[PDB]
């Protein structure tokens, strides 16, 4: 029975509308998990969802417990920095080390969406990469925000709408910068759903492929977005180098290690 008391504080991940999450170290062991803390006062289809299902690439939950005024979720943490960091110290990843993210990405969608579970929040912000350089999908920010048009025009947030924030994250991957990057800000409600998203001349005809896709502001044209769902996504032209079953069984090889001993390495807990 965890509690309060097991966990030692070591620092702030997140605060928010609806909590925080705090980076906390289990005392008995020594692990280490992120806890996500609950106004009771404040607040279904996060907890208990997310409890039961695991995945390679899902952020795990490890303990959940409440206290008399708040809901606390003990989850796993991984330790190999933030995709947005290692992005950032890179301006851009290479066609094929983003593909790698992609499809560790694509194979968490498919599970999810298999369960009949919208995770509405595949973006740069909710990825992380552990010890050995495995993608994390982590559920919370540690930003303009890139929402799907048909969240944007119909508060409409279904399978493809996980499509959309694929093609974004991969897309600001590939090309190091978000679609609409420079123009404004308050624009982007008009463009996002107005606006022709454009391609550097530098891109694989085939990744200018994918991303023309991910992104197509009709949900019901997007790709990803047919009956077959993540197949479309994985039997697309960028993605034929893959073995979805590699994938799932973290048998691929991350394109870049990390540089953590142990998991309990908190070399990337700061800056």
């Given at each position: 029975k965890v509690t309060m008391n097991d966990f030692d504080y070591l620092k702030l991940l997140g605060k928010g509308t609806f909590g925080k999450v705090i980076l906390v170290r289990?005392?008995?062991?020594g692990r280490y998990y992120a806890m996500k803390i609950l106004r009771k006062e404040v607040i279904v289809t996060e907890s208990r969802v997310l409890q039961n299902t695991r995945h390679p690439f899902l952020t795990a939950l490890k303990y959940a417990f409440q206290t008399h005024d708040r809901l606390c979720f003990v989850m796993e943490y991984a330790n190999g920095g933030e995709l947005f960091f290692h992005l950032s110290r890179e301006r851009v990843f290479t066609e094929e080390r983003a593909r790698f993210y992609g499809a560790e990405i694509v194979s968490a969608l498919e599970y999810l969406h298999s369960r009949?579970?919208?995770?509405?929040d595949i973006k740069l912000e909710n990825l992380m990469l552990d010890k050995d350089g495995h993608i994390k999908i982590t559920d919370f920010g540690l930003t303009p925000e890139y929402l799907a048009p048909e969240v944007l025009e119909d508060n409409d947030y279904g399978r493809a709408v996980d499509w959309w924030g694929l093609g974004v994250v991969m897309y600001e991957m590939m090309?190091?910068?978000?679609?609409?990057?420079?123009?404004?800000?308050?624009?982007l409600f008009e463009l996002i759903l107005m606006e022709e998203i454009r391609f550097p001349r530098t891109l694989s005809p085939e990744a200018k492929s994918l991303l023309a896709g991910l992104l197509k502001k009709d949900p019901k044209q997007?790709?990803?977005?047919?009956?077959?769902d993540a197949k479309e996504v994985m039997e697309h032209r960028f993605f034929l180098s893959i073995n979805w079953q590699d994938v799932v069984q973290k048998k691929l090889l991350p394109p870049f290690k990390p540089q953590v001993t142990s998991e309990v390495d908190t070399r990337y807990f700061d800056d």
């Open positions: 289990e005392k008995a062991t009949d579970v919208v995770y509405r090309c190091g910068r978000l679609p609409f990057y420079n123009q404004d800000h308050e624009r997007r790709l990803g977005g047919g009956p077959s």
